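Help! Submission page says 'invalid entity' but I think these are all valid:
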Amino acid sequence: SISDLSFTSFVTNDDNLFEETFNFYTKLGFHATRSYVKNRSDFELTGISDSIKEIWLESFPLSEVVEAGRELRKPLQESVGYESEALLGYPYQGGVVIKLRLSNEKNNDLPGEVTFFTASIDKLKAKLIEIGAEIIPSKLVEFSTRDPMGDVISFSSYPSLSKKITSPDF
Amino acid sequence: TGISDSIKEIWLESFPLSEVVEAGRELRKPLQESVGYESEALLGY
Amino acid sequence: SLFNGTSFITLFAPNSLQASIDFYTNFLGFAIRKNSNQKLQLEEDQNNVSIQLILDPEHAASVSQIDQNIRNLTIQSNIAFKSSSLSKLVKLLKDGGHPVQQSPNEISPFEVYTVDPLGSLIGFGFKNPFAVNERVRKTIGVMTSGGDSPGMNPFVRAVVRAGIYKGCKVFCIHEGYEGLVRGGEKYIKETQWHDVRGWLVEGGTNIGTARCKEFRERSGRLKACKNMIDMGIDALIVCGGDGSLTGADRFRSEWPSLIEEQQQFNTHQNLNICGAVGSIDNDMSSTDATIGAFSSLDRICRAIDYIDATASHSRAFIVEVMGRHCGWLGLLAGLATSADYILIPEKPASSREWQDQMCDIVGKHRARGKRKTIVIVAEGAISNDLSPISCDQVKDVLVNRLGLDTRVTTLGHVQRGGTAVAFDRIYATLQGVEAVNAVLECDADTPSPMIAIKEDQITRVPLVDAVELTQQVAKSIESRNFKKAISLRDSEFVEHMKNFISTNSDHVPPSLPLEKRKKIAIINVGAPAGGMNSAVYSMATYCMSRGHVPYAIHNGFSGLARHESVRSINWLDIEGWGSLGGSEIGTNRTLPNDADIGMIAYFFEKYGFDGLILVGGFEAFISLHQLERARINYPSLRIPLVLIPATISNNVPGTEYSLGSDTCLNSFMEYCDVIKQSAAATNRVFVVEVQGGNSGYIATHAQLACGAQISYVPEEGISLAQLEMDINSLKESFANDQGKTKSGRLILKSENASKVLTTEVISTIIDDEASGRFDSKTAIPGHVQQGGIPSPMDRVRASRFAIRAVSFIERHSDRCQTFKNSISFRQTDEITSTAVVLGIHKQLRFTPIRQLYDFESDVPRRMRNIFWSNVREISDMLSGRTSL
Amino acid sequence: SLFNGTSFITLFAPNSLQASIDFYTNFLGFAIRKNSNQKLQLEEDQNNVSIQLILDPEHAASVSQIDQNIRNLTIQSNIAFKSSSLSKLVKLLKDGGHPVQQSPNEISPFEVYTVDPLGSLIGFGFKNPFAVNERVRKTIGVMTSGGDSPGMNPFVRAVVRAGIYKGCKVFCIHEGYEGLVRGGEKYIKETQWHDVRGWLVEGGTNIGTARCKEFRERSGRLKACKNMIDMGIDALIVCGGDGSLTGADRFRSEWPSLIEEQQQFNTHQNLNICGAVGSIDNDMSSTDATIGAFSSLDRICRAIDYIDATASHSRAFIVEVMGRHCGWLGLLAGLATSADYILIPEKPASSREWQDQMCDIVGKHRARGKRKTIVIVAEGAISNDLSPISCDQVKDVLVNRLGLDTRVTTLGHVQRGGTAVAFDRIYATLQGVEAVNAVLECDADTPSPMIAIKEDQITRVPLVDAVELTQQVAKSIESRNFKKAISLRDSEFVEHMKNFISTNSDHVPPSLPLEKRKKIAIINVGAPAGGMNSAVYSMATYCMSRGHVPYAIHNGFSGLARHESVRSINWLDIEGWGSLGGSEIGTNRTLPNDADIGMIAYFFEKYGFDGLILVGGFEAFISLHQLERARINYPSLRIPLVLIPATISNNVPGTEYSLGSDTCLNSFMEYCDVIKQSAAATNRVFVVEVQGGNSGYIATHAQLACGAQISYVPEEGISLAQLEMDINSLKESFANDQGKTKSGRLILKSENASKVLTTEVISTIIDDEASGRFDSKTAIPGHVQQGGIPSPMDRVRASRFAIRAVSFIERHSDRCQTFKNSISFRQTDEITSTAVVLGIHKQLRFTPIRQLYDFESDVPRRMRNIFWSNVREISDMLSGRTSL
Ligand SMILES: Nc1ncnc2c1ncn2[C@@H]1O[C@H](COP(=O)(O)OP(=O)(O)OP(=O)(O)O)[C@@H](O)[C@H]1O
Ligand SMILES: Nc1ncnc2c1ncn2[C@@H]1O[C@H](COP(=O)(O)OP(=O)(O)OP(=O)(O)O)[C@@H](O)[C@H]1O
């Protein structure tokens, strides 16, 4: 009874690789929502498998932007198709947890990859050429890219990919 | 205790000398039923 | 944003792919998409879950195999899934042969591995309480045989009611076998439900017993057989002694007495017979306790207690005990009252004359300081050469060989009179119920059963095998193989015999070599409970017997940490402790962490304790866990830690019996009897407030033992609908009392059953609803239910458990000293096993604190899953209660 | 063992030794041993403490100096000492210029440095609660002047009692100056303690006021002077308005009227005079509030509230307000009731005609949706050219220039009548007390005082300087410098004027440039309190005024974490919120850590909040601390966090005033009045149960405002001895009622004062002890004391505080974004300053949560050091209570 995917975790031994990966996604629209380091005040929810540093990045979902004419700001859940649930309701839902292991011990990276959805395929392609590399695709995948981690990019389970502001029903 | 932090810490104790109990078997430590033990608000003398 | 969502996970397989296809489909609930292009795994409709699998050689078989084994150490990049109720998937993986990683095993994130390793699962984005979990007819005949045994009336009451409830006519065969042989309406009377009213309190046998000379011959056995077929009795239930049941067994084999002198012979072709032991002796071999044994033991100890309750030199006292065949009463009384010398048939003097043996033991005791010498003489008191030893024989040795003024106390019929003790009432009742079921469940291919108790649990044992075994013991005594006779008796008897002689023997050189001798400490944690002092007495005397140094930690963990309350235990100072109520050491509810855990650890190393015995309730339970978990910090705590549960409540997991619960049960049972008697004197109900806290154990058992109509328990609570139903029950009960016995009515309400509907509130509602037809009054005795003088059962059980505790510490100390003398202690499985809870389960077993704390307890403010569910059902059956 | 003990510490010095000798002797209590061998430091007798100091060159000056500075970074081998009460040594070191290291600053181990660094100190061996800490006569004359002002009777009551208590004759000068000029027994009557009974409730002035034409001239001023010397009045207390006090001030300077026409001239040589402002106007310059101002403001708002409590297009309503010189009543009513347009003398239309100004503002409001237009017209309503603007003038503009059917409401005498509001009763009383003390403490070299309130605190200000300043304001208005006149008024007036025009102005372009515009959120945490909705209304309207985006977090932290309750605030939707009771947003007691702190943090970043305003009680206080402490984990929380205390209790540290306490005080005061009135009708006492929890603030103030004989508070508790003493007081009180006014008797008991001695128990004890001479009845209103419609004070204070909160977030947001956009956040001092509590202290100040949580609060189950100690003393004085 798995709803969807919660997050992807990337573990590294090299701090230099860790920080360069953080800055890579930072340039790509990610925001660090939670941070950890070796102080007894720090809250622990994730830390195995332990970790010396951990940065939780979030590329926030897309909601129906509010007009006020001044400059555009995010709405609330007073939005178009928001249906309140027992917990939170029902908006293009992606978070990636970056973990850093000690000096020593640690497994080697296996061959698998993750494919994320983008409603701005060309805008992403342009930032990647402005930053890193753009791998050619195989199979829904539009293209692919890399850092110590190789990743794929396409459109979600829906038919197509950027109308954030939705059409209200009749 | 852990500052000043620390990766490892060992607390060693060379226990005080008390009035040893006879039982003839082999000698063992007494209690605070000992000679000059005077009980205080906390622990005694 | 630009990373707008998460479309799918892409996995590359070596060349084979199918193993993973089977895993993600059976374990995760995925499905292969229709018409595959080469040779997509989607979960379900209206979703967005997808995993892509490709057979391209991009992932190696050698690398993947090495990575799987590498993970078998309890780091790599992974993928987490949002999934409700992770607990169900973790069990499905573990049982499917897949290892998993989780937070408190309660649980937060779950993580397993496939050919595609590290497949995580979270129960939510960030920290918070998780995502909600999605979507047969036969007429019975009862009889009693042999001498009066307390509990015979409770048994008959049970048989009459159980049989009635199961829809069958119950006949009470008056004057046992005599009544069975003579027959007729004169001796075989049909009994009604209301005819056995308040028989719980009644002593002896209301039916009656008689020795039938004719039934000893085939002459009478045939006459009895006719009378059963004439009365239409399809089944017989005998409640009596050894021969009483052997004669029933002979009657069973001799039943094929077809005697031509066919309608009746066709119907009444087979004898449905069931036995229950109604004896004070406890001589029957296939049961641990016979009905009346503990009440008789109680009468004896009541006398010994009175004897001990005085001053004086040159004084000896003889307690002449009833019990012709067995020495159980002598041995247990001797144990419960710490008697100097016991004369029982299983253990006569062997290497020297009984007079020399007695005088030596008595002498040693007086020499060390003990001024009140108590000698117990069994009815079956015998010498090697089977010569019976009389009381006068024993008296003259004490008066002439020693200078003691001896005063003999003889119980006689006292040992058969009085009401049955709580244990006898509870057990005789359940045995009565079982006897009916056994008799109904019986089929011609099933051997005739005898109802037996085996470590606090009702069982069925073949009567032939039990009759044969008792004879084997008598044969061993008569053939002068006493050592053999002792082993032939139940395992509890052999343990008690060992326990007694060891505790009776400080005044003889230690039984262990110098190297094997240890420093064992004892504490009392929680509220006082009967047997706390007995557990201390038995442990100290057993330690002296082995050559150990027994230490007592006065006034719990607070006394140790704040005051260095480690005190030595002197044999003369602990004189009469086994019979004293409360805690002489001092007990409190202070936890090791509420006192200084570092200071407890410091004193443990200062005094160099090789083990610890905790005697106490739930606080002592938490204490064990707190001491066990602190082992990583303190090597001083890396020693065997044993808990002997002691609470009147019985809220501690690990045991089915907590020390002091029988003492408490019996005091409350005596209180309830007086209250019901008072109700019987005036159309009145009593709402009796019960102790035990959040544990409904005492009210359950008191309801059964007293004949209470209802018992309101904390596990169930009190609903208005049940309260209205129960009040209407009372309304009807009193409307139907017109004609029957006025036995009185009780409602037992555990204080914790309702905070709103209190004893006082409940009673006012009864009066309101009663509309003058009857009244209600409360009975609130208070937190006095503890009781003074502990029950002989509590004194005895505490001795047994204290010794098993010392013996466990002996066994495990060697293993512990490895973890003690070493740092780098990673808290293994070999060490966690040493922090244990001693308990009764169906079997006497030590259970590691870890499994009971994490899984078997309401660790929180509740301090408590119950076992007594069946007892509850039966007590509602016997009182006509209708639940909802 | 072999290392049996610790003899002494040996320290080596470079060549000089003396600096350390001075340190260990002054700071540690050591002493130099008698007759030194070369050129030993022992502590005391019957001990074993010793430190050896040697001057041998074994330790270098360069190395030691470098090590001392190296330690100034908050590892090295050290020595620890066993020392009781470490707190005292830590203060002695820190203040002596020595740095120290400790555990919770409460504290466990203390560590400092000398020339011999790292000298540790522990308060015990291992973890446990620490080692216990070792070892003048003059006769007064009162008068009232000017128009009726609620609170004049409470003031006179105070003066009569205070003066009596201080041992001096009090005379009440009837008909003010007229009575003073006419003199005699007819107007100057001696007043007794019982003569001012129940005057708290009484409206207007029982003494009376009269405009004396003669006193305006030297003719009368002389006659008045004679009458005082004839009556033997050594001191005068005037309670009145502006001119009423200016005339008293002129009488003060003109006092040297020796006039020969010497015994009396020698004694009555100096005029002891004291002033108190008895005006509804609030025109006097050196005080923040005049006596009667808030009651008058209350009458006005009561009318506006009734006007708003209806439907309708083409409707306008005019509220004609009494108040000739000042615009304070108009401005505050306008603010409290969110009026469209106010016509006050300090702010007449300047750049355009008042009709054009009014029509524009009114028009804009109607256009945006507001259907009920309320226009407030001051008595002093004026134009630029000082032409007075009438109601009819205003009516015709609304009826003819706009199509509105206008209905005028004129308060008239309503604005002077009725009982004084809780604030007026409390303040007038304390002012009366102070006026007496001031008059007694007066000396010829001391300038005549006027009693003034300065931000909820009673002060003394020179009457001449206050008279001069009020004239300066009048001069500014008359000289047409309104901007100047506004600045000349008290700082609260200037802030309120700014607050009103900004909240009145969404319908005009934002006051901040695009870059400086932020996203501010608001939450309500705890139980509801009057002003919660006003704080929300004012914050949202002020945000729109600046160009910020106001967000409302519905139903506290639980609503955010479990349901994403971030909601936008629309101006039309919040119509009338400033006047609504409770919390429209939704409030609860759920803490950020009891809700998901990670989820709160997630939504803070999802919506990108630039600041947070918490409106609530102690749970909102803990909430701040919990959000502040989570900043290390979540960059999203590294923004200014501001708490505006809102509790009826006033338990939150940081403020002396919590929002809703005046609303609550007033509702309970109204309840107590009815109860006392009922007691007055029947020899009866009422024990009135008071709310506020563990905070005794409300019962303290209710005792003063209602004239309760006793108030039982949680900080003091209720002793049996005090209860017996207080009951005997009641016994005597009723025995002495024979002859005096029957005003009734109250005892106020905070529920938390005693768990055993409850309202109901206390009252039954009174009846038992009373022996039929009087009876006792309880009054338990319940947790209803919250109150609906918040007090004008609460509506006004909430507006002021909400704006100060937004303004703080504006100031601190730039600094925060440094910590927000950066990882490696080490939790500095620059950031901890942003998590603050807005409060009143003597001064309106923001206090960092860290200092109030760690040091100023009972963080635990108590949720609460008090300031109201003096108020308590005075209320016991005024009621004749004797403590123990
Ligand atoms: N009947 C008894 N009652 C009480 N204690 C006994 C009894 N028999 C033995 N003991 C305990 O055992 C200790 C040793 O007893 P003993 O020296 O006579 O050896 P034994 O093996 O039990 O005797 P035997 O070989 O004659 O049967 C006694 O001193 C006593 O403390
Ligand atoms: N008497 C008033 N009553 C209510 N709001 C007022 C009043 N005077 C000004 N305002 C508010 O201030 C806003 C701007 O006021 P305005 O357009 O008249 O400029 P101003 O500086 O107040 O006027 P002036 O220069 O004529 O004194 C109004 O739209 C309204 O919010």
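Support: the input was valid. A stray whitespace character was the problem, and the output above is from the cleaned input. Chain D has 28 helices and 30 strands.
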